[PDB]
Design a protein around this ligand. Structure first.
Ligand SMILES: CC(C)C[C@H](N)C(=O)NS(=O)(=O)OC[C@H]1OC[C@@H](CCCn2cc(CNC(=O)NCc3ccccc3)nn2)[C@H](O)[C@@H]1O
Ligand SMILES: [Mg+2]
Ligand SMILES: [Zn+2]
Length: 842
């Protein structure tokens, strides 16, 4: 054993020892209990970043621990390969997106392997391969024939200078983000998943996820957004029926979740597309301009509630069906056509948006809800205005005194008797649009024929292959410009026909890949039935919080789709879910001779102030934020590995913060992690150079010294602490601190005697197994110096409950014949014959 710790000498050999033993290459062996530990697979970006290393180290800690506990552990890895990154890299570099993607995959694979993740590489998938995406084309055709996937015209933001479609996230002040050109709203046919057919299942099944963070579940519930309310029809006043036709001339129908406040409605509001808006804007230009601004908006949903609410009176009136009050109709920008009836009622006394709106326009507020002897101020909003559970109705004639649920029913009966309304369940959830006007994505398996319509490609003709021999030029989606791809024959009638040129939303690949990993070379279906039966669901999923809504919902949806097709037998893909925090770092800048800032990379700055590393001109240290190319503050993990080895990188990431907390880059803390590894190395080297290995202490410990009993207490306390930090808390930094404390006590204990060595052997053999999930290379190497058994069949350390009982302090006591450290406990009820009796001289 070399005296100095040299990670490049040891990490390659340890990796070849794990690979030679095929310990991460698992099969469906019904003899070992399974465990499926999954980290969210990466985009083949080019190179790993520190978020990648944080995530896959967390995955590896948990997989290695469960493996050491005897589980058949599958930890798979692959590549979320489609999407815009490669398309833009292709445009800028004059290279095919596929060629760029496959080179990135090859490089990033090398990096992952060198970090020593215990990954089953025989299960690798790449989603841009036809061996992969044919199976989502297959599922699509099945759901298309069932109406679960359907085609319908929708509205997109068209950028006419860049000749491509943009999401609302890419529209700033009505303009394209790169081009700066005004976007055009266009109606085009697109494809949708009927996810709203499964809304109630997706909402309720969340309740089975006892090992999910409540915040993720609550975020899903808000997105689905179920409400039970009331449809209410307000009759249109005779004076307001001009330009209306059909049911819109007779009534304005609305949806509300608060029918118990219908006596408090002081006005109604309609979307800009609503026929009432159209009819009243006919002669009023300010209304026309307000309607146009609403249509031109591109407010992303994450920003919807933040937009400033605005409205315009129409001069048309409807009649409240419970009290006959005539309310003015307003066009408002927060009422969205396609949600419900595109019209709402407004109660400023008990809904805060209605309060702020009515306060803006001086619209009236009528209190109808009381909560205790609380005063009602019509000019200031108090939180109890919105209380549903503890309110009672006031100012509502027949309904005064009722609580929420009784009044809801009373209103329902009143409205139904009248023909004016009925209970109604609604969901904020929209159907899922999967059409993308992009080249680098999975082709949609549809052929368009003027005789037969939109026809699915039959199963025998899948995949529809995306041609890899393409270089996007910017001027529009390539597939629409390639007759060699879209010109075909109709599979139903044989006649002239055209393939669909839109590709799929890339969320589709990531909605089922965890099942594909179960049988990644299966060519007769999405996932083999035998391997789905064995692996079941993912036991532990690890990933970033930005995927808590869309990706998770989509995966849960696809799992229930696949379940209903007969392919899988679970309701939920993910049992345990762990959300890792961001990785952030200091920023540095010089100022520009244009009044701006040039963001410098940390690698080219030295500290003391701070300046360049090759130069000496100072920089300006500024704030800490998530690593990103925007402020040039990303720290390249390959240079951290080059400088210190993989074990140091993995230890720093786990020690620096709990996985949920944001991790702050620290040169100082990276050096602390390395020196701790050096210390682990030296501790074992020094122990072995003073006598060589011995049989680890085991068994009855009566007759060990006090000092060595104490070390065994700390030893077995550490084992239970660590096990509970890996298994229960998932708090890997406290488990490292625990092992450091154990080595501190060992450093202060004399282990020179014969029984001393046996306890030191025990301590050290436990320490390196306890830390093997975090830094497996050095622990594998040191374990081989201490003990000749395979580390992984030695298995996780066991707690010795005997070493936790602390030995008895037993004696009797007597005041006047009749029944410092003992005289202090025995006065808590003065001779003291050593050990047996305490006599208290009365
Ligand atoms: C399931 C599927 C939908 C997954 C999809 N393929 C995906 O999200 N794929 S992915 O590849 O994005 O990530 C894969 C996983 O692992 C990394 C996690 C990173 C969180 C963000 N995050 C980033 C950072 C720190 N950033 C850096 O170090 N930037 C360095 C840099 C600077 C300058 C230029 C280049 C690089 N901290 N947290 C991420 O949530 C996820 O769990
Ligand atoms: Mg359960
Ligand atoms: Zn045809």
């Amino acid at each position: 054993m070399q005296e100095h710790y040299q990670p490049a000498a040891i990490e390659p050999a340890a990796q070849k020892k794990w690979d030679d033993a095929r310990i991460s290459n698992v099969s469906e062996d019904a003899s070992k209990p399974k465990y499926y530990c999954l980290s969210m697979f990466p985009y083949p970006s080019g190179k790993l970043h520190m978020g990648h290393v944080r995530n896959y180290t967390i995955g590896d800690v948990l997989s290695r621990f469960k493996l050491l506990n005897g589980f058949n552990v599958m930890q798979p890895m692959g590549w979320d390969a489609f999407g815009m990154p490669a398309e833009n890299a292709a445009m800028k570099n004059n290279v095919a997106p596929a060629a760029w993607t496959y080179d990135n995959i090859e490089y990033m694979k090398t990096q992952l392997k060198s970090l020593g993740f215990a990954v089953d590489w025989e299960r690798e998938v790449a989603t841009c391969k036809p061996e992969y995406y044919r199976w989502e084309q297959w599922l699509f055709t099945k759901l298309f024939e069932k109406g679960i996937v359907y085609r319908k015209n929708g509205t997109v933001n068209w950028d006419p200078v860049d000749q491509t479609v943009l999401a609302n996230e890419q529209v700033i002040d009505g303009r394209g983000w790169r081009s700066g050109a005004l976007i055009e709203k266009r109606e085009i046919p697109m494809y949708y998943f009927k996810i709203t057919d499964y809304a109630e299942e997706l909402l309720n099944d969340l309740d089975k996820l006892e090992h999910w963070p409540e915040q993720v579940k609550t975020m899903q519930r808000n997105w689905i957004g179920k409400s039970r309310g009331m449809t209410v029809r307000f009759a249109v006043s005779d004076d307001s029926k001009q330009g209306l036709e059909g049911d819109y001339a007779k009534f304005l129908q609305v949806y509300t979740t608060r029918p118990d406040t219908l006596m408090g409605a002081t006005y109604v509001a309609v979307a800009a597309e609503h026929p009432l808006a159209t009819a009243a804007a006919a002669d009023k230009p300010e209304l026309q301009a307000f309607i146009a601004e609403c249509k031109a908006g591109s407010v992303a949903e994450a920003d919807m509630a933040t937009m400033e609410k605005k409205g315009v009176p129409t001069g048309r009136y409807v009649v409240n069906p419970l009290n006959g009050d005539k309310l003015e109709v307003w066009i408002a920008n927060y009422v969205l056509w396609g949600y419900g009836d595109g019209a709402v009622m407004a109660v400023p006394a008990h809904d805060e948006r209605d309060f702020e709106f009515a306060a803006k326009y001086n619209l009236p507020k009528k209190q109808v809800i009381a909560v205790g002897d609380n005063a009602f101020d019509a000019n200031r909003w108090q939180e109890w205005y919105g209380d549903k559970e503890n309110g009672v109705l006031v100012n509502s004639g027949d309904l005064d005194g009722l609580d929420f649920q009784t009044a809801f029913d009373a209103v329902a009966a009143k409205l139904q008797s009248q023909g004016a309304g009925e209970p109604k369940t609604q969901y904020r959830l929209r159907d899922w649009g999967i059409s993308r006007q992009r080249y680098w994505g999975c082709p949609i398996p549809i052929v368009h024929c003027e005789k037969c319509g939109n026809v699915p490609v039959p199963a025998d003709q899948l995949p529809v292959v995306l041609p890899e021999n393409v270089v996007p030029d910017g001027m529009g989606s390539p597939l629409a410009k390639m007759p060699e791809f879209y010109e075909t024959s109709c599979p139903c009638c044989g006649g002239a026909a055209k393939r669909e040129t839109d590709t799929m939303d890339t969320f589709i690949e990531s909605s089922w890949y965890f099942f594909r990993y179960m049988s990644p070379k299966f060519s007769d279906g999405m996932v083999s039935a035998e391997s789905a039966k064995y692996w079941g669901a993912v036991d532990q999923y690890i990933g970033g919080i930005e995927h808590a809504i869309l990706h998770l919902l989509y995966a849960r949806f696809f799992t229930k789709l696949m379940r209903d097709e007969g392919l899988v037998n679970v309701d939920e893909p993910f049992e345990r879910l762990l959300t890792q925090g961001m990785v952030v770092c200091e920023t540095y800048y010089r100022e520009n001779d244009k009044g701006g800032k040039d963001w410098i990379n940390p690698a080219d700055v030295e500290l003391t102030s701070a300046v360049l590393k090759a130069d000496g001109l100072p920089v300006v240290i500024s704030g800490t934020e998530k690593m990103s190319k925007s402020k040039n503050n990303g720290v390249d993990p390959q240079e951290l590995i080059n400088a210190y080895g993989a074990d140091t990188a993995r230890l720093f990431m786990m020690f620096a913060a709990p996985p949920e907390q944001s991790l702050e880059w620290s040169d100082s803390g990276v050096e602390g992690a390395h020196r701790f590894l050096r210390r682990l190395w030296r501790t074992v080297y020094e122990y072995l150079k003073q006598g060589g290995a011995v049989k680890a202490f085991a068994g009855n410990q009566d007759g060990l010294s006090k000092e060595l009993k104490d070390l065994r207490h700390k030893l077995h306390s550490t084992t239970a602490k660590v096990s509970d930090d890996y298994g229960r808390r998932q708090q890997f930094n406290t488990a490292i601190a625990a092992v450091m404390e154990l080595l501190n006590q060992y450093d202060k204990t004399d282990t020179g005697s014969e029984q001393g060595r046996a306890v030191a052997q025990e301590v050290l053999e436990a320490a390196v197994r306890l830390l093997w999930p975090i830094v497996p290379h050095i622990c594998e190497t040191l374990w081989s110096e201490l003990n000749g058994a395979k580390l992984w069949e030695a298995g996780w350390p066991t707690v010795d409950e005997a070493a936790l009982v602390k030995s008895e302090i037993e004696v009797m006591v007597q005041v006047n014949g009749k029944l410092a450290d003992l005289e202090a406990a025995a006065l808590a009820n003065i001779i003291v014959v050593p050990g047996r009796l305490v006599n208290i001289v009365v």
